[PDB]
Design a protein around this ligand. Structure first.
Ligand SMILES: [Zn+2]
Length: 231
């Protein structure tokens, strides 16, 4: 109604009464500006964050936006995989005293990827759901590890009480021409891993993704079908 708010170098798009997409950009000569998306979730008297911005500085701006726009404390942040777009503002989260969580494997891979591990490790049961003891007080955040896909550590998040689920860098948009960068990809499991995500949040009608605008469930089926062509 007032459109998408520009704050610092960042853009915020309200997806639901309690949920916002946060967006930061990296201008890569020859590619133009590349968007990275994450979530902000107001749960009662606290805010929960999914992913960082590309950099620590942009991640500090997310925190400033929350303080100024929502004025509630940030209880915790979850990072979807170990890569710059999801994990790049870890130091800013630490400096702010925010409890950080990532897949235990993300935390294992972090040093190699040249990044800072989150404070806490999430572990997942055989059915892919996070062990509740490793994710204390996650509220509406439901964390699912679909298996190896775009990376081996990629996880995914639904928001209880909304129609939203977030597939991270695993799901591409319904018109995407390719699955993009496969260097860390497990190409034989990728398709199953996408369908697993779909089945893990069967009710979500809005799929937020890393690099593009929110899409419908078509994004999941499109991604799965492209990934079928690799196996
Ligand atoms: Zn990635």
């Amino acid at each position: 109604e007032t459109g998408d708010q520009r704050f610092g170098d960042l853009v915020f798009r309200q997806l639901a009464p309690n949920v916002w997409q946060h967006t930061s950009y990296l201008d890569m000569p020859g590619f133009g500006a590349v968007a990275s998306n994450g979530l902000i979730v107001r749960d009662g008297g606290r805010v929960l964050v999914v992913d960082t911005a590309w950099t620590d500085d942009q991640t500090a701006q997310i925190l400033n936006w929350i303080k100024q726009e929502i004025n509630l404390p940030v209880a915790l942040a979850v990072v979807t995989h170990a890569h710059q777009d999801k994990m790049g503002g870890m130091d800013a989260l630490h400096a702010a005293g925010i409890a950080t969580y990532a897949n235990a494997l993300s935390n294992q891979l972090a040093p190699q990827e040249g990044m800072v591990a989150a404070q806490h490790s999430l572990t997942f049961a055989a059915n892919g759901w996070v062990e509740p003891a490793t994710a204390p007080n996650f509220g509406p955040l439901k964390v699912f590890y679909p298996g190896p896909g775009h990376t081996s550590d990629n996880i995914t998040v639904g928001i209880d009480g909304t129609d939203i689920a977030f597939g991270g860098c695993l799901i591409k948009d319904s018109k995407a021409k390719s699955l993009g960068n496969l260097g860390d990809a497990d190409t034989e499991h990728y398709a199953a891993s996408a369908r697993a995500f779909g089945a893990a949040f069967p009710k979500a009608s809005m799929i937020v993704m890393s690099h593009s605008a929110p899409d419908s469930r078509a994004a999941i089926t499109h991604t799965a079908r492209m990934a079928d062509k690799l196996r």
